[PDB]
Structures are given as C-alpha cells and as structure tokens.
Design an enzyme around this catalytic site. Sequence first.
Site, PDB file in Angstrom:
ATOM      1  N   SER B  47      20.308  64.407 140.938  1.00 17.67           N
ATOM      2  CA  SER B  47      21.057  63.246 141.992  1.00 17.67           C
ATOM      3  C   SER B  47      21.755  63.633 142.939  1.00 17.67           C
ATOM      4  O   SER B  47      22.442  63.055 143.818  1.00 17.67           O
ATOM      5  CB  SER B  47      22.826  62.930 141.398  1.00 17.67           C
ATOM      6  OG  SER B  47      22.158  62.244 140.225  1.00 17.67           O
ATOM      7  N   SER B  95      28.738  59.951 139.651  1.00 20.43           N
ATOM      8  CA  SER B  95      27.059  60.295 139.907  1.00 20.43           C
ATOM      9  C   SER B  95      26.761  59.439 139.425  1.00 20.43           C
ATOM     10  O   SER B  95      25.473  59.103 138.103  1.00 20.43           O
ATOM     11  CB  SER B  95      26.247  62.028 139.598  1.00 20.43           C
ATOM     12  OG  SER B  95      25.501  62.137 140.292  1.00 20.43           O
ATOM     13  N   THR B 186      26.487  67.390 143.425  1.00 22.53           N
ATOM     14  CA  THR B 186      26.001  68.222 143.039  1.00 22.53           C
ATOM     15  C   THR B 186      24.398  67.451 142.047  1.00 22.53           C
ATOM     16  O   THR B 186      24.451  65.880 142.377  1.00 22.53           O
ATOM     17  CB  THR B 186      26.521  67.726 141.425  1.00 22.53           C
ATOM     18  OG1 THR B 186      27.269  66.522 141.008  1.00 22.53           O
ATOM     19  CG2 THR B 186      27.845  68.764 141.843  1.00 22.53           C
ATOM     20  N   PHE B 188      21.767  67.258 138.850  1.00 18.78           N
ATOM     21  CA  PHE B 188      21.130  68.233 137.499  1.00 18.78           C
ATOM     22  C   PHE B 188      20.477  66.967 136.485  1.00 18.78           C
ATOM     23  O   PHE B 188      20.956  66.461 136.298  1.00 18.78           O
ATOM     24  CB  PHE B 188      22.885  67.903 135.999  1.00 18.78           C
ATOM     25  CG  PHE B 188      22.415  68.577 135.207  1.00 18.78           C
ATOM     26  CD1 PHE B 188      21.535  69.784 134.634  1.00 18.78           C
ATOM     27  CD2 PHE B 188      23.025  68.068 133.470  1.00 18.78           C
ATOM     28  CE1 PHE B 188      21.329  69.841 133.822  1.00 18.78           C
ATOM     29  CE2 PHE B 188      22.611  68.368 132.327  1.00 18.78           C
ATOM     30  CZ  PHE B 188      22.210  69.293 132.584  1.00 18.78           C
ATOM     31  N   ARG B 230      26.578  76.043 138.572  1.00 15.62           N
ATOM     32  CA  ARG B 230      25.774  75.135 140.242  1.00 15.62           C
ATOM     33  C   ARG B 230      27.426  75.469 141.109  1.00 15.62           C
ATOM     34  O   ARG B 230      26.393  75.360 142.318  1.00 15.62           O
ATOM     35  CB  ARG B 230      25.156  74.327 139.308  1.00 15.62           C
ATOM     36  CG  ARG B 230      26.455  73.318 139.500  1.00 15.62           C
ATOM     37  CD  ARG B 230      25.674  71.892 139.163  1.00 15.62           C
ATOM     38  NE  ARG B 230      26.897  70.614 138.579  1.00 15.62           N
ATOM     39  CZ  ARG B 230      26.894  69.578 138.229  1.00 15.62           C
ATOM     40  NH1 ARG B 230      25.035  69.221 138.359  1.00 15.62           N
ATOM     41  NH2 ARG B 230      27.262  69.631 137.711  1.00 15.62           N
TER      42      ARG B 230
END
Lengths: 247, 245
Positions: B47, B95, B186, B188, B230
Amino acid sequence: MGSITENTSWNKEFSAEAVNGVFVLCKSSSKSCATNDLARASKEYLPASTFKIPNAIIGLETGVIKNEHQVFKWDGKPRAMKQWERDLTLRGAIQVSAVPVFQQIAREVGEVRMQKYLKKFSYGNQNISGGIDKFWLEGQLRISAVNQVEFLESLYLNKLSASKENQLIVKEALVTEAAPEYLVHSKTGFSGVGTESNPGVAWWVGWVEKETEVYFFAFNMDIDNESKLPLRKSIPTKIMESEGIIG
Amino acid sequence: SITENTSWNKEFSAEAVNGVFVLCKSSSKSCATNDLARASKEYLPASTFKIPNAIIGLETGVIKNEHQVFKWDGKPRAMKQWERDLTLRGAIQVSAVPVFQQIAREVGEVRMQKYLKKFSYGNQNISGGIDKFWLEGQLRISAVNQVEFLESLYLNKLSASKENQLIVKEALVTEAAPEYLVHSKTGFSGVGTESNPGVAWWVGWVEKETEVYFFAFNMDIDNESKLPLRKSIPTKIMESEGIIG
C-alpha cells in the site's frame, strides 16, 4: 452558512471555567451551525494572530512570500519571544505566531493591496487603519465568530480569490493534529490582557475533517489573565469531544 | 551516495528482524542506512503504492478533486474499516485497497505504465493485473528509490501539477506537533509463503525547524504480530537522531 441555532447547554463548559465567550460549530453537509450564544457569535473582535491566515494567503498571492519552502531568516537581533529567535518556514512562523515575520509581510504587501484582498475575502469590518503592521493586533480591524467560519469554509473549498495552489499551501501550514480518523487545521490568537473594564480576546478557529464530514469552528473569549489562555483550546476541545467529533 | 551506519542494526537484532532503514537529511544525495545491499534491494510496494496511484488518479482526472467521496456500494470488503464512504485521505489512512483498485482500473494499463516511467518508480513492472500488481504482481521498488520519489514529491518536482502534489501531501500527514510534521505511508504485503516472507513498509518524511529528513523502512515478515515493528524500529532510530519525539 445555511442556518444557525442556539444551544445554551454548551454554556456548561464556560460556566465551569468562569469564562465569557462563544463557540460556533458548523457541519458542512447539513449546512448547519450551532452556537452557545447567538448574540456573541455576531460580536466582532480583534483577530490578533488568527489574521495570519489571510495575511499568509495575501503574502503568497502578491509574491511577497515565494512559496512554502521559503525560509524567513532571523537577523540575530533580539525578538519579543525566544521562540521567534530562529529561522522559520511559513508553517513554523504560523505555528509559533511569529508576529515580526508577518509584520514584514504586511509592510511589503502594503495598504492598497491589503485593503483589496480583505474586500475580496469579506474579512470582518475590513478596517486596516492605524499602521499597516499593527492593524490586526492593536488597530481597528474586527471580525465575528460567524465571519471566521464563513472565511474558513471558503478556504477549505479553495473558493477565496486566490490561486488554488496558494490556498493549499496555507491549508498545509495550518495542520495541528493528525489522527487516522480525523485531521484538525487550526489557528490561535490572543490580543493581550487588555485594560481596566476592557478585556483582551483569545481565539481558536479552524476545521476538523472526520469520516466524510467537515466541521468549521470558531471560539473566542474575554481574557484579562494570561493563565487562562489554555482555555481557548480546552473549552472547544471538550465541546467537540462531547459531540463525538474528536478525541 | 549511501553510507552504512552499523550501529542501527542493534534495533533490528533486538527483535530478530531482517530489514533496512534509509534516512536522508536535506536531500537524497546524503543517505545513511544500516545495510548497503538491502537499501537498494527491491520489494513489492504494497500500500505504499497509494502514493503514486493517488497522484496518477488526480492527474488523469479519475479522482476528480481534492474533496471527492469514494462511495461504498454496500457489498462486502475485506476489512470492516473499508465498508464506508471515504475521502482520499480516509482511503489512504486506512489503506482501503478496493478504492485504489477501482482508481487503477480506470487509470488503465497504458496510462499507469506511462506515469510509473515518468516517476522512475522502481522496476516499473505493472504486469499481473491492473488491480493487483502492487499487491501480488511483479512491481518492485527499493528503500533508496522510495526516498528519491518522496523527495521529488516534497519538492513538487514529480511530473504532475503542484496542486495535485499538494493535495496528496495533505492526505499523507500522520503526525503534527508544534516542532515537526510527519508525512508517511505504511504497507504490508502479507505473511508470504514458506521460504518467501512478506514485506512491511513505513516510508515518509519529517519537516523539523528548517530541515527535512526523508525515510524508508522495510522488513521481512511472516507473522502479523510483528507488524508494529514497521513503525517502532524506525521511530526508535529517528528519536535517537533527535529528529522526532
């Protein structure tokens, strides 16, 4: 705005702190405002550093401020506040309310252009008399809470008579709280403690984006004791928390 | 130029994490990292790709404006937090994959390829499905390339209007304090498969005083419980450098 309605139960937060003041909160989608005090919502007060919002837009529009990456250099000469004794970006100068940076901006804009833009922006009584670098701090300029929210909504929608780019630059500089579920843009002001029978004014104005809604807000209060200054944020924060908008 | 700072590995070893942090003061011409090789190794962006995808959506007019609302059709989405109308900032912040899947479909393969070329975005490989190449396809980008891309965005130097770059910048604000502003995103990809870990990212920049710091973090991941690392590892490094906190 579409409508305004009085909600006297909000006086709760004012009474608790022994404060005379007003909060105006408008929801964009329903074009509806609420306030604790309709009369005070229309009363007009010195903008103090809330004036940095239009001053920044006007500075950019006229080319006095180059862009958001311009650095305003400190000369090393003593300033009224320690916080101002450093080089600052536009956000930095707005965030710490660096008066002398904006006094220089106002001087370079000059009276004719400043008058023109306050007319375009419908900014308060549009009275800039008594010193081009002093009018919003100690001069005759006055604006109401209702007029602040109207002005901020125009900024939010990029509808002021300025480029979209410049409106976006100033909006960026006004961010003061970010959370995953809400974003706050805001600006404080404080005219000082006033004189006998003549209190100063403190402001907090801005807007909150939450879900797909937008809320415009303006708070002012009478102030004669600097120790009361944090109330300009805590009273409106408590109200917006109670409304479920922030917190 | 990329300089190794061995001491940063202490923050990874403590958590048994394989990963990289790249941190650049002022510009991408002066970067530091815990690992030279991994700094330039390319990974699926997941993302973090919402950054270029939002710019492209605005440039092409697929995203009509700063204040568009992406309506939920009431049909199931993979996360409950996506099952609602969203603004551009709201969709980026949670996201919301399906919002950006439809943006990507409407941009289309020809235009998507063109803009990733213009942006020098990673390996520029969009094959694998127009609505999934950044999630499970062949697109790859390194931490160093993320910082270069973010620097261009910061400077309004991407091949896009300044207005659209400013709109996306506001949508990326994630922490505001009197002394500094953080913009970030972020990513993932998931937990991967056996012998093939997923990747987690945190990328962004910090505006503090009159300075700017660009950052990109990635890590291998095969268990969702490790995901908060993260943010926490790079936050610890940047706090140690006195940049945030």
